[PDB]
Amino acid sequence: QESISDFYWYYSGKDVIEEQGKRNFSKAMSVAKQVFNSLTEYIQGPCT
Amino acid sequence: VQFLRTDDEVVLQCSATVLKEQLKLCLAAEGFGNRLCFLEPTSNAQNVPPDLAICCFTLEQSLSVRALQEMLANGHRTLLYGHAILLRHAHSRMYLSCLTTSRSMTDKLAFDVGLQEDATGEACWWTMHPASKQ
Amino acid sequence: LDFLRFAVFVNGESVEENANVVVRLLIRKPECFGPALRGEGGSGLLAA
Amino acid sequence: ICSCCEEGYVTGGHVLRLFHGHMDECLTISAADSDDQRRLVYYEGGAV
Amino acid sequence: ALIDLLGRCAPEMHLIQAGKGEALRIRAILRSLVPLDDLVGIISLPLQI
Amino acid sequence: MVVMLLSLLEGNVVNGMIARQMVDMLVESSSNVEMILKFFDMFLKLKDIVGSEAFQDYVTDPRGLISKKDFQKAMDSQKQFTGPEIQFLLSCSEADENEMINFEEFANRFQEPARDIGFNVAVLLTNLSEHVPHDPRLRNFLELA
């Protein structure tokens, strides 16, 4: 989360995102998607 | 536990082991007049009272470093190690800053820290760092 | 110091990315500069 | 400094006025450059 | 070699003209570490022939 | 993200501690949730205003599109969007040579990709509202969404 926040904040001034930034964001959010799916699984059953 | 946030008046303190004693002192400054910050003893309060009207620094703004460089180009947020902050004197209402005047003679590279009339540039902003390894 | 020079200045253009890191690591440890340029008792280049 | 402080109720580090009895009367040191070397304490009233 | 490395880590002319904050700060640190007097005085130091 | 939050809220009692912490998270990101719900809201209202017939009296050329100025003044005339909202709609709109913005394409560009996340957000808000009934902090979130 902190790394994606820093990446976005660097790209905030440049409204147009380069293709390298786009693919880097895509692989980062794929990793984040897998981590989020891992968390769902950790709590998908009603495990208190 | 008790993580400091934005808009919290804070005194900055440190310690010195001179003469086998624990000062536990804190910095202060009289903004109208001697702008540069001077350390003020805090120990022996029962002996002499310490002046605490010039020790209050309110954390007006707290924000990351990448946000800092963006905001430079341009409620109570908890401070995190590595983030930037904007301390401001209470009586003086002037922001704490690293004055470029190299008053110090001992350390040739030591810019004397003082008070800036307006929070402009990177001079007023300050960044914390975790001293403990934990 | 020789290796640091080669690490920084290449092809008639000093690398900013490495120059900033080199000077940061140099300044966090003023002991790199020897008896001269010392915080106290460092005299100067002329005296040294 | 602000540690379990209260708003609207008195706090350490504040500066205030100690009105003795009625609000017309107030605790105060002395007039300017008085003959008491500004060391005695009174409860003057009016513009003070 | 130390002064060579410092002036060799010194930022670029086009960065200075662009006014980049980090470049100005690096120049400021170098100018804080080594003054112009020390440079000229050693440059003018007698050199045995 | 929303699925993970729902999995957190799975098997939650009324006024549950995890629900209260979720509401604290929402009100800590109050502005952020406001702009996310606002983003979904503006394009839903943009689809509705594309379907509306006064906006058809605002579209002029037989190209099937609507000019930039015409779209802006139609948005202001219906007052479905405030000033800066219309400016952001113009920023996201597809300008043409005549400024003839494809309102159909502009409306349905975000209709399909945002459907699943909008539905999940609605599920999360309904779940939070019905398991934290006395929640004035969540009242504004519900009314903005």
From Swiss-Prot, chain B:
PTM comment: The N-terminus is blocked. Channel activity is modulated by phosphorylation.
Compartment annotation: Sarcoplasmic reticulum membrane
Give tissue specificity per the record: Detected in skeletal muscle (at protein level). Fast- or slow-twitch skeletal muscle.
Ranges for the MIR domain? 76-131
Any domain commentary? The calcium release channel activity resides in the C-terminal region while the remaining part of the protein constitutes the 'foot' structure spanning the junctional gap between the sarcoplasmic reticulum (SR) and the T-tubule. Pore opening is mediated via the cytoplasmic calcium-binding domains that mediate a small rotation of the channel-forming transmembrane regions that then leads to channel opening.
Anything else known: Binding of [3H]ryanodine indicates that the heterozygous channel is activated by Ca(2+) concentrations 4-fold lower than normal. Single-cell analysis of cotransfected cells shows a significantly increased resting cytoplasmic Ca(2+) level and a significantly reduced luminal Ca(2+) level.
Q: Which family does it belong to?
A: Belongs to the ryanodine receptor (TC 1.A.3.1) family. RYR1 subfamily.
Assembly description: Homotetramer. Can also form heterotetramers with RYR2. Identified in a complex composed of RYR1, PDE4D, PKA, FKBP1A and protein phosphatase 1 (PP1). Repeated very high-level exercise decreases interaction with PDE4D and protein phosphatase 1 (PP1). Interacts with CALM; CALM with bound calcium inhibits the RYR1 channel activity. Interacts with S100A1. Interacts with FKBP1A; this stabilizes the closed conformation of the channel. Interacts with CACNA1S; interaction with CACNA1S is important for activation of the RYR1 channel. Interacts with CACNB1.
| Free-text function comment from the UniProt entry | Cytosolic calcium-activated calcium channel that mediates the release of Ca(2+) from the sarcoplasmic reticulum into the cytosol and thereby plays a key role in triggering muscle contraction following depolarization of T-tubules. Repeated very high-level exercise increases the open probability of the channel and leads to Ca(2+) leaking into the cytoplasm. Can also mediate the release of Ca(2+) from intracellular stores in neurons, and may thereby promote prolonged Ca(2+) signaling in the brain. Required for normal embryonic development of muscle fibers and skeletal muscle.
- Write down what this protein is called: Ryanodine receptor 1
Q: Which organism is it from?
A: Oryctolagus cuniculus
Gene it is expressed from:
RYR1
